[PDB]
Every structure is written in C-alpha cells, then in structure tokens.
Amino acid sequence: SVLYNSASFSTFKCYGVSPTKLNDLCFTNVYADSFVIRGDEVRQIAPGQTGKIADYNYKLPDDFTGCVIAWNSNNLDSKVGGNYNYLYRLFRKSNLKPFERDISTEIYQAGSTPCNGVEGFNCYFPLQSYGFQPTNGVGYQPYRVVVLSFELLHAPATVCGPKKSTNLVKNKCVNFNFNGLTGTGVLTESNKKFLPFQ
Amino acid sequence: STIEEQAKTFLDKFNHEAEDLFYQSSLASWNYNTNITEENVQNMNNAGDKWSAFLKEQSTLAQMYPLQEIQNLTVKLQLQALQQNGSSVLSEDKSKRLNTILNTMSTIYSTGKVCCLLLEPGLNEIMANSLDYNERLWAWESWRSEVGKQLRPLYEEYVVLKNEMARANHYEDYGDYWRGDYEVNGVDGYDYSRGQLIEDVEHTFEEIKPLYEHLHAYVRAKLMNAYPSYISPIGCLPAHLLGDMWGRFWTNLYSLTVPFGQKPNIDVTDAMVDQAWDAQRIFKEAEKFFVSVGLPNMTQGFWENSMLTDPGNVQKAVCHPTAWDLGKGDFRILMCTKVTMDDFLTAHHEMGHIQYDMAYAAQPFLLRNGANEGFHEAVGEIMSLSAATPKHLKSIGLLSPDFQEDNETEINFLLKQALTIVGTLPFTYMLEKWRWMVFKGEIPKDQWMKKWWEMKREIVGVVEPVPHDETYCDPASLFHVSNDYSFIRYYTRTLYQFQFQEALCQAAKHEGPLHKCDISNSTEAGQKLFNMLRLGKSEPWTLALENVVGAKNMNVRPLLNYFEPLFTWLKDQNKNSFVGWSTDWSPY
C-alpha cells in the first residue's frame, strides 16, 4: 500500500490480483525479476505477447497473476555519450520457456552455412546493444522494469501481513478482537499474570 | 533454408550498426555548426569515412543474394538502396577523375571574377534592381566570357563518364538513371516503368502552357515603358532581362512589376511585435498547427537539443534553413530565427520534414525516406503555403481573427507566388528534356550551344541576346549540375504542392480555389495525410498517392484552381499586349 501512492513510478500495473487486494493476502514466495529495457518494449511485457523480445529474452507465463513495476530513468542506467552495457538476444534457434534464464552465447543460423564458432556470411551476431542516450526521444529512454511473481504451493506461506492496529479502551462493554478470538465484554485490570507464552 | 527468410537477417544486422554510424556523422556536423573549429571538420570526415566503408563492404556481400527471388514485395525495395554502387562502379583511376570535374565546376561558381563580387546575392541584385539596358547587359556578357569559357573541356568529359557508369548498372544513359527512382519496384498491379515518365510530364505542359503565356506577356508588357526601342510588342524577353543568370528565379522581377497600388502585399510582421515574440515563441506557435490538424505532437528532447534562438555575432556559428535528421528519435533544427515574416514562412516549410521522419520512426532504417526523389519537398511546400493564407492565420495565435482581404489584395498575392512556384516550371522541363538528348546522342558534341537557344523560344520564350559559339557553356554552372544533383526534383514539387492541398481541403467541406482554405480545426485532413507519410520506402509512390489525392500520376488541374483569379485578370490585361510572343523578333 505504501508503494502505490508514492507517485514515483511511471507504470504500476498488475494482472489478475488487484493492487488493493494483495495487501492482506498470504504469499508462499515472491520473486524479483529486474531488467532494463527500452520504452517500446514495455507493452510487450504482458501475458500473451510475441515479437523479438518476449520470445527471445524474458517470457511471461500464461497464468501470470502478479504486477509489473516500471519507472522512468536516465541517470541510474545511462551515462553521458551513450551507454552500451546492456545487451539482449535478438534471434535464436529456439524460444525460451517462462521463468528461465540463458547466459550462453551462440551464433544464430539463417538458412544455410551452419553457424558454430564462425561468423561472416549467413551467420550474424545476435547480442546487440541498446541505444540508451539522453539526447534521443521519449521512446528510446531506458526503463528499469521490476517484475514480481506470485506463486502458491502446498508449503505454509510465511509472507502474509494481515491488518493494522487500533487504540485501547477499557471500562466499557464494547467489542474487541484480540488475535483470532472475537469477544464482547468489559475489559478490567487483572492482577493474575499468566504464563509468558500463553 | 528459405532464401527470403535469411535475407531479413542480413538486413537486421545492417540496421543495428548503420544507425550508430549515421548518428555519429550527424552529431559531428552539429558541433561544427555550433562552434566554428577546425577540429570538428576532421571528426566529420572520420565519421563519414567509416560510413562509406561499412556501406561499401556490406554492398559486396549483398550481391550474392538473389534479387529476382523476392515475393513479399517489401524486401526488394530494401535491397535497392543497399546494393547500390554509385560512381565507384567503374575503374579506380576514373573515380578520382569524375569527382574532380564536380570540384572544378563548384570552385569557379563559388569564386567571383567580375569586377570581385559574387553571383548571389552579389551579381543577382545588380541585374534586377538597376533599371537600365546597358548596365545589366555588360555584367551578363562578362560572366559568360569568363566562367562559361573555363567549362568547355570539363563538361565534355562529364558526359562520357556518366554514360559508362550508367550502363554498368543495367540501364541506358545518365538521364535514364534519374527516371528509375519513380519506377515501381515493389508492389505490383500499378505498372509504371521508366518509359512512362516520358509521357504525362509532356501532357501537363500543354494545358499549363496558356497559363504561362499570360504571365510572360504581363512582365514583357510592363518593361515596354522603360525600353521602347529594344523591347517590341511582338518580341520576347532576352536572357539579361530576367533577374537571374539562367532565368530560373523570377522573384527579383517583382520589384519592377506592380499589379495594383491600392492594396500592398500582406505582412504579419506587425502582429508579431504586438504579441511580444522572442523568436523562440515562433516554435511554440508552430506546434499548435500540427496538433489541431491530427498529426502527432513533438518530442520532449526537441526543445533542449535543437537551436531555437540566435547566438549572435559574438559566437562563431552558422545557420541556414535546412532539414537535419540525426536518427534514432533525435531531431534538430538550425535556423537563425528572427522577428519578421521571412523566418515565419520558412519555419513551417522545414518543420514538415521533421514531422515526416517521425511518422516512420518505428519502421526500420531501410524503410525510411521516400521511394522517389523530390517527394519530401512537397510535404514542406503544402505547410508553408497555408502559413500565408489570411483565412487560415485568423484561427491561431498571430494576426487578428477579424482580418479579411478583398479582390484587389488577392492579385498581389497570386502574382508574387507565380514568380517562384510556377515561375521555374518551364525552366525545369527545358533542361530535363535537353539533357536526355545530349547524354543519349541525339545532339552532336559541337551543337550544345546552338540547340540550347532553340529550345528557349519554344518552351520558356527567351531570345538569345549574345549569339554563343562552340566555346561557351551554360548548364555546367548550375548548382545542381556542379554538385551531381537531379533537377527533376523541383518539377514534381510544383505539381504535388497543389494536389496535396486540394485533397486535404476537400474533406474539410471546401471546394473551389485554394487561396482561402482552412487547415486548422479539422482532424480529417491530418489523418488522411498521415497515411502515406508512414509508408516511406515500403510502398511505391503510385499506391501512396491514392491514399490522399486519388491518382497515379501528376495532374495540372489542381494547379489551375489556385491561380483562377490570376488567370482571369491576366487575360484582360494582356489582350492589348499580343498575348504570348513570337519567335520571329531578334534582339541582334
């Protein structure tokens, strides 16, 4: 809830689970997929898209029920004179399954001339480079997208965060809900201390 | 695997590295324009050297891929601009000899030998605002006997070298290569070969010929009061009485001819001072013209990367109306913006070139730019023409909304534009057809000056004041010929200027002439124009023309609707002045 009304993110969208409903819901484990892309590639990061980025770099599952955090930036990932430190795969012999990383380096094969350690004709270098420059337009600006994944398994979830607390009032016949027990009675001071774990 | 599949991989690899090299050559050119230093000249040459070396290296490996095996009708248009050879297709010894001729014609044209003063704007203002017969005649004869005499051995070798270079790329002559840009080489169904360009152009000149007769007879009849002995009512106008060395720009003759003295030409300079403009303020007012019509807005980095004010004389910087395109979403403009009407009309003329590249920004670099030359200039002329209409300026920032003109004011407005737009129309058709006979072989090598004056009286209507021999040379001193540029790009600019204006004003519920149409407050004219401006090199110009106008070739009919009040007024004023001219009278 404190990360939505901060007014510091350019794109704060979710899928399936509403942003105002995941605050009081348990989660088994939350991932953290952080990557820097361009401006036109933000629309391709969605469950059910295709192209040359979602099918060759980061693939999203069909049943993705998480959120997509993305903000504008031009100083934390783009220096003066052009930043060519972020590479990406353009073509490959096969696609990538959802939630799978690839750090290998191979030459793409187009038609004949099988490509295996030799470049030139019919063999091109797939690892290109983004043109993150502060003198370009708006669509060429870098966006540090952080995708969070939500999964539920049979293991007991350790991340829930249920509700906030209130004030305390005694000498009144009001309603109180301490822990999971709901009781309606008058709270009075007692001198019989119980065990320090009950 | 598939031949068409692997061909796209070779083009994606080229575009991922050509945009980085092309941006370096454009960025180095902006550094020299901002600060005049000798270090920026070497950086521009080193950036352009790697661009010419990488383009020539990728063009050799691209010849192995078959071109006739393209069925998508899209990859073939991307291989034509990559597999080009240019003037380097011949021998290595002949490459430096052909390039040297281009430098000899530009060095003599840049230097001045008349005494000292240059040609433009030096000698250009002498043979126009002097009002004399023996003063402006001596300056025109001295230029042909010094500049034209040093171009005879250089122009003869320019024909033999361009003929062999054109036949190396499976063509005919030099004039046939320029006609190949208009040939449809992508989507079929719209057949338009290079031989079709010979027609159409000759057909539109016959219908526009009566319009040119009323304009040439009006200027000839005005100078009869100043030259009653030489200029005859049944004669013509010599070459030295045109306000230009070749008779191309006739705007200089407007100061001598005055159609009506009650209403002067319109001027919006007084409206700029009342609203307190700071020169940059013009760029803010020009942005609303493209937003209210339907075109997309500008970028965020355009107001901080492009020059908007004047640096002054204390800073070494240059400026000239130009369309710079750095690429990759970066767009800059270098124009010394002042506070007058001249800089306001040229602002919208060059801003259209920036909006053109933004249409196909997401498209690859090979699909950028038009398929034919001269099409980009037509996009800028339709924007500057609407910037001078009084009915259009009353709905924006400058001027008062309660401003209108009468019939006496439209005469001065249509006459001024007739000496620039349609004034150079017969001059372009004359040189375009005359060069097709010299390069082929229909004109002997010793009859270049004799046939030159014969085509003037039959197309432009200019007699020969000084009979030239076999030693003079007129076309070699042209700015386009000396720089290896095609002159046909200005012919299509005049025709397409009124065809695009008629289509945008038709959907806005407006018919008739085009001197009072409205462009703003109409989202339909901007959506139709944006259709073909996104296509670029992906589709030919014949199919893209039907998306706006609705034809496949040029048409002179929309041009006659704009000059309708002018054609009627010139008919009654020239009917006592031998409408037209006769080729029997001679000045000598």
Curated annotation (Swiss-Prot), chain A:
Result of altering residue 91 to L: In strain: Omicron/EG.5.1
UniProt-reported outcome of changing residue 81 to S: In strain: Omicron/BA.1, Omicron/BA.2.75, Omicron/XBB.1.5, Omicron/EG.5.1
Region annotated Receptor-binding motif, chain positions: 72-143
Effect of residue 10 to F: In strain: Omicron/BA.1, Omicron/BA.2, Omicron/BA.2.12.1, Omicron/BA.2.75, Omicron/BA.4, Omicron/BA.5, Omicron/BQ.1.1, Omicron/XBB.1.5, Omicron/EG.5.1
Effect of residue 128 to N: Reduced host ACE2-binding affinity in vitro
Documented effect of changing residue 119 to D: Increased replication in human TMEM106B overexpressing cells
Phenotype upon changing residue 87 to Q: In strain: Omicron/BA.2.12.1
Segments of this protein annotated with the region Integrin-binding motif: 38-40
Effect of residue 80 to P: In strain: Omicron/XBB.1.5, Omicron/EG.5.1
Effect upon mutating residue 3 to I: In strain: Omicron/XBB.1.5, Omicron/EG.5.1
Effect annotated for changing residue 121 to V: In strain: Omicron/BA.4, Omicron/BA.5, Omicron/BQ.1.1
Record region (Disordered): 90-125, 154-176
Residues covered by region (Immunodominant HLA epitope recognized by the CD8+): 83-91
Effect of residue 136 to Y: Increased binding affinity to human ACE2
Impact after mutating residue 88 to F: Decreased HLA binding to NF9 epitope. Increased binding affinity to human ACE2
Effect of residue 87 to R: In strain: Delta/B.1.617.2, Epsilon/B.1.427/B.1.429, Kappa/B.1.617.1, Lambda/C.37, 19B/501Y, Omicron/BA.4, Omicron/BA.5, Omicron/BQ.1.1; Contributes to cellular immunity evasion and increases infectivity
Documented effect of changing residue 131 to S: In strain: Omicron/BA.1
Outcome (variant: residue 154 to P): Increased resistance to human covalescent sera neutralization
Effect of residue 6 to L: In strain: Omicron/BA.1
Role played: Attaches the virion to the cell membrane by interacting with host receptor, initiating the infection. The major receptor is host ACE2. When S2/S2' has been cleaved, binding to the receptor triggers direct fusion at the cell membrane. When S2/S2' has not been cleaved, binding to the receptor results in internalization of the virus by endocytosis using host TFRC and GRM2 and leading to fusion of the virion membrane with the host endosomal membrane. Alternatively, may use NRP1/NRP2 and integrin as entry receptors.
Stated name of the protein: Spike protein S1
Gene source species: Severe acute respiratory syndrome coronavirus 2
Residue range from the parent sequence: 366 to 563 of 1273
Curated annotation (Swiss-Prot), chain B:
The protein's Enzyme Commission number: 3.4.17.23, 3.4.17.-
One GO cellular component term noted in the UniProt record for this chain: cilium
Reported impact of residue 332 to A: Strongly inhibits interaction with SARS-CoV spike glycoprotein
Organ and tissue specificity: Expressed in endothelial cells from small and large arteries, and in arterial smooth muscle cells (at protein level). Expressed in enterocytes of the small intestine, Leydig cells and Sertoli cells (at protein level). Expressed in the renal proximal tubule and the small intestine (at protein level). Expressed in heart, kidney, testis, and gastrointestinal system (at protein level). In lung, expressed at low levels in some alveolar type 2 cells, the expression seems to be individual-specific (at protein level). Expressed in nasal epithelial cells (at protein level).
Mutagenesis / variant outcome for changing residue 364 to D: Increases very slightly the interaction with RBD domain of SARS-CoV-2 spike protein
Record annotation: effect of changing residue 1 to P: Increases slightly the interaction with RBD domain of SARS-CoV-2 spike protein
UniProt catalytic activity: angiotensin II + H2O = angiotensin-(1-7) + L-phenylalanine; angiotensin I + H2O = angiotensin-(1-9) + L-leucine; bradykinin(1-8) + H2O = bradykinin(1-7) + L-phenylalanine; neurotensin + H2O = neurotensin-(1-12) + L-leucine
Family, similarity comment: Belongs to the peptidase M2 family.
Record protein name field: Angiotensin-converting enzyme 2
Origin species: Homo sapiens (Human)
UniProt gene name: ACE2
